[PDB]
Design a protein around this nucleic acid. Sequence first.
DNA 1: GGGAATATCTTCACATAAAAACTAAACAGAAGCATTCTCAGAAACTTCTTTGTGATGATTGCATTCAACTCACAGAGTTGAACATTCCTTTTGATAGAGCAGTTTTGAAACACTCTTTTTGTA
DNA 2: ACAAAAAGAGTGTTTCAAAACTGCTCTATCAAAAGGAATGTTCAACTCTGTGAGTTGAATGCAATCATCACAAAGAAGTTTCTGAGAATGCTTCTGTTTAGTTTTTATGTGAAGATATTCCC
Lengths: 94, 99, 80, 78, 98, 103, 21, 22, 92, 92
Amino acid sequence: GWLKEIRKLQKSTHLLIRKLPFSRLAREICVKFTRGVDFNWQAQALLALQEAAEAFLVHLFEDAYLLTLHAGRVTLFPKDVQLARRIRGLEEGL
Amino acid sequence: SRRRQGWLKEIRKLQKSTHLLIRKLPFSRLAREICVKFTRGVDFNWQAQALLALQEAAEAFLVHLFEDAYLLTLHAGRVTLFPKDVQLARRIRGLEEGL
Amino acid sequence: LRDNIQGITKPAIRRLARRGGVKRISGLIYEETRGVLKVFLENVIRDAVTYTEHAKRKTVTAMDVVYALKRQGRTLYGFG
Amino acid sequence: DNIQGITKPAIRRLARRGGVKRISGLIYEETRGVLKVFLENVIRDAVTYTEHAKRKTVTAMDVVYALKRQGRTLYGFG
Amino acid sequence: AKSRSSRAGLQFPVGRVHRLLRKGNYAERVGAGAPVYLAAVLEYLTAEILELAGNAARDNKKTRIIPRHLQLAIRNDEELNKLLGRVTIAQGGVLPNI
Amino acid sequence: KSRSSRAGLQFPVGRVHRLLRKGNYAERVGAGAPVYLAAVLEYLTAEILELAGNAARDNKKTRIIPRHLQLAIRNDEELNKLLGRVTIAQGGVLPNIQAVLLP
Amino acid sequence: STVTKSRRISRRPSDWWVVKS
Amino acid sequence: TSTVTKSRRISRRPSDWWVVKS
Amino acid sequence: RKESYSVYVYKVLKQVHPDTGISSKAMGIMNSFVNDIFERIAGEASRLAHYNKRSTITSREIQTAVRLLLPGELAKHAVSEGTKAVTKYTSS
Amino acid sequence: RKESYSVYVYKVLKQVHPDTGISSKAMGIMNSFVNDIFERIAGEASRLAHYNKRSTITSREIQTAVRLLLPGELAKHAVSEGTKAVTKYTSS
DNA sequence: GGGAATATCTTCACATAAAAACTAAACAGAAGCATTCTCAGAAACTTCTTTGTGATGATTGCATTCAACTCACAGAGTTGAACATTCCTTTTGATAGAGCAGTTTTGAAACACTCTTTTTGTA
DNA sequence: ACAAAAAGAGTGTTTCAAAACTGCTCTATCAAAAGGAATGTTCAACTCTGTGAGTTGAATGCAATCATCACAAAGAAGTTTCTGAGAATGCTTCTGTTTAGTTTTTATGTGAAGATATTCCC
C-alpha cells in the first residue's frame, strides 16, 4: 500500500500541504517578525513560499532516508533527520 | 597492554597543531601532473604560494570531510570509518560541497 | 500555539515523506518536521519582509520571496 | 605515482585531525580518489583564470579566485 | 534594415542583451562582440533545455511542455543538473527513486 | 577635518567611498553610505580582534596568530555563521573529539 | 556567559540541528 | 540510457558521482 | 513596456520541436532560467574584468566566464556556438 | 603602492587590546576578512538599489544589506554602530 | 598505599626571525564651487488583498491490532593499531640561470555620445 | 499610423595591446642527512550475523470538521506622472597620511634542566 502511495506521489506535482493552514502559519510567523507594522501577502507570495518549503522538506526527507538505510533501518527517525541537517552544513541544512 | 590510548594521544596532538600534514613535494608533483593533464600545450609554472594555498584548501576540505563522515560512522553504531561513510557524506553534502 | 503549527497535519507530513520516498515513518518525525518547517519559514520570511520594507511597501510580493530564497542559496523559477 | 605520493600515514594524520579513531583499509584509496577529484576542480578554474590573464604562471590569487567561485573562501593568501 | 541578431544568425535579441549589459553596470564599457557571444550562449542553452523538455513531453505522451517536463529534462541530464543544482522548478515534482 | 575623524571611526571613510565608486556597484554613491559601511566594518573587526586577543591571552601569548583567529571565529556562533564557508590558512581545527571516544 | 565591549553575548555554537520545544 | 542531443553533445544521465571510480 | 524572452523562447522552440506547444507557467520558468544564466555569466565576466584591471567586458570575458560556469561538454558547445556567432557577425 | 587596511586593523587592535600584537599572517587574514565583508555588503546594496530601480547606494541600502547578511545579534549592533556614526557625521 | 620511572610539566637563556618603530615622498583625499540630475512628494487612478457567507464533501482524527519492525547480545570471524628495523624520500640550502612577470610608453583600434532614420509592438 | 527601441554615421576620447626592458623568482640540480615511510607480524579489538524479545506504525473504518470554491464589497495600497530642491558629481589645488624602505626591539621557539604528574607490582 505504501508502495503504490509512494509511486503515486512521486509522479504528481501538486502541493501537499493545505494552502489555508500554510497561509495561517506563514502569517503568524510574519507577525512575530514584525516591528509593529503588519504586512499583506500577495496570493503569489504565499504560493512561492509554499513551493519552496515543500521542495526543501522533500529533499531533506530523501537525505534523511539515506541515513536510515545506512544504519540498517527502514524506519525514519528524528536522529536521521537531525544528522542530515548537520551534514548539509549550517546553510543548506537549516 | 601494548598501548592504552595511542590513537587518542595522536588525535589530541594533531587537533592542536596547524601545520600541513601532506608533504610539499609529493603534493606539488600531484598538482602539476593534474595541471598538465588539463593543459594540452606547455605547462604552467606555479608560484610557491599558489601550491601552498592549494594544499591548505585541500587539507581543510579533507579534514572537514573526515569529520562529517565519522558522524555517519557513529550513526551506524561503528567506530571504523568505512568508504561507504565517505561516499554518503559526499552524497548528502550535495554536488557543490561534495563534488 | 493551539493551532497554526498543528495545521501541518500528520497526513500532510506523511505525503511529503512518501514523495521523498520514505517507506516507514516514526511517530516523533511529525514534531521534528514541524520544527524544521518552522525554522525554514522563519529564515525566508525575515528576509522577504526585509526586502519588502526596504522598498517602502506593505505587501509581501512574490519577488520578495524569490529574492529571499535566492540570497539564501535556493533559486526558485516559476515566479519571475 | 604522484597520487600514490599521498602516503598512508599522511592520510591517517588527516583522519586523526578530523577525529577518527579507527580507519578501514580502503579509506586510503577512497581518500586519494576524493583528493584527486577536489584538485581537478580547483586546478581547472585556476588555470582558466591564468589563461584569461595572458600569463604562464599560476598565482595564489588564481587559486583563491578558483576556490571562491566554487564557494570555498580562503583567507590566508589574499 | 538588418538586425544584429540576424547578422549573427541568432533568435535572441542582441540589442536587448547589449542594453542589459550596459545598464546592469557590469563594467564601465562593453565590447561589440560581447552581447553577440552572450546571446549565442543563452540561445544555445535554451535550445538544449527545450529539446530535452520536448522529448520528455513526447515520451510522456503529451503535446505541450509543462514544468514537470522541464524538471524531468533538467534532472536527467548530468551537466544541466549540475548547472541548475540549487534551482527549484515550481510545480516540477521529483524523480522516481526507490 | 577627515571624514573618518568627523564620524568617530578608525576606518578610512574616503577610501571606502572611492572603492564604492570604483567597484561598479551603482552609478552614484550617497554621502552617508561610506560612513555607514566603514562603521560596520570597524565594528566587525573589533569583535573579531577582541575574541582573538582573548584566545591568545588564554594561551599565554601576546601575538595573535591564525590559530587564534580560527579559535575566536569557530567559538562564536554569530561569527561562525557569518564565516561559514571560509577557510583560514594555518588555522587548524577546533579540539573536538566525540564523546563515544573518550573512555 | 561571555559579553564583548558591546552588550553582545557571544554564545558558543552548541547545537542547531536539533529542533527545540 | 545515454542520449545524443540534436548536436554532438552526448547527454548522459546522472550517476553515483559520490563513488570514487578508478 | 515589460521586457521578457517569451517570443524568442517560442522561436527557438519552433526550431527544435516544430510541433510542440509550451505552457504559460513553463514559459515563465524559461524566462527565469534565461535571466538567471544571463546574470551569472554577466557577473562572472564583470569580476573577471575587475580582476585583470580591465574596464571593458569584451567577448573574451564572456568566453572565459562561460568556461567557468558551465560543466564540461556544455561549455565546449557553448564556446563553439558563441565563437561561430561572433565570426558570422563580424564577417559583415 | 599596494593599499592595505593594516594600519586601521592595527589601530582597532590597539583600542581593544592595548598591549597585544598581531602577526603578519594574521594581519593578512584580517585584510582578507575586511575585503570579503566589504564585497558582500556592497554587492547586496547594489542588488537592492537595482531592485528598487534606484541609481544611488545610500546609507539606507547599506543598512538593509547589513540586516540581510549578518546574523541577528551581530546585525543589531552593526546597525547601531552605523546609525550612530552617520548621526555623528551629519552633526558636523 | 609506596617507592620507582617517565612523560609531561614549568623555568631560564639565547639567537633570531619577526614584529614594532622611524622617514620621506607621493599619492590620494579634503575644500570649494558650478552643474546636473535623482528622488521625494502630491494627486489621481486602479487593482488586488482582506473580510465575510454558505455548501459541501473531501479530508482529517480517533481507536485497535497485529504484523512488521527495532534492539540487545553472544558468538564467529575479520582486521587495524602497535611495534621493531630499513631505507629511501623529503627537506634544506645553495646555485645558476633564464624565463617570465611587471612597468612604461605609444599608438592604433574601438567604444561612448549624439543626432538621424528606421523598424516594430499597439492602434 | 504611431510611439519606442534599435541600427547608422560621425566625432572625440580612451584604452588596451604591442613593444622593449629589468629584475625576480621558478625550475632544475645536487648533496647530504635524518627521520619518517614501508614492511611484516600479532593479536586485541572490532564488525557481522542470527535469534529472540519487545515495540509500534500502517491499515481500516467510522464520524466530525474545515479547506475550498465561489462570490461580492470595500478600500488600502500600489502605480503613474510631474516638479523642483537638494544632493551627488566634476574639477582644481593643496596638504597630510599611507606606504615602502630602514633599522631597532623582542616574543618565541629551542634546548636543556629539574620535578611534578602519571603510572607499574602484589
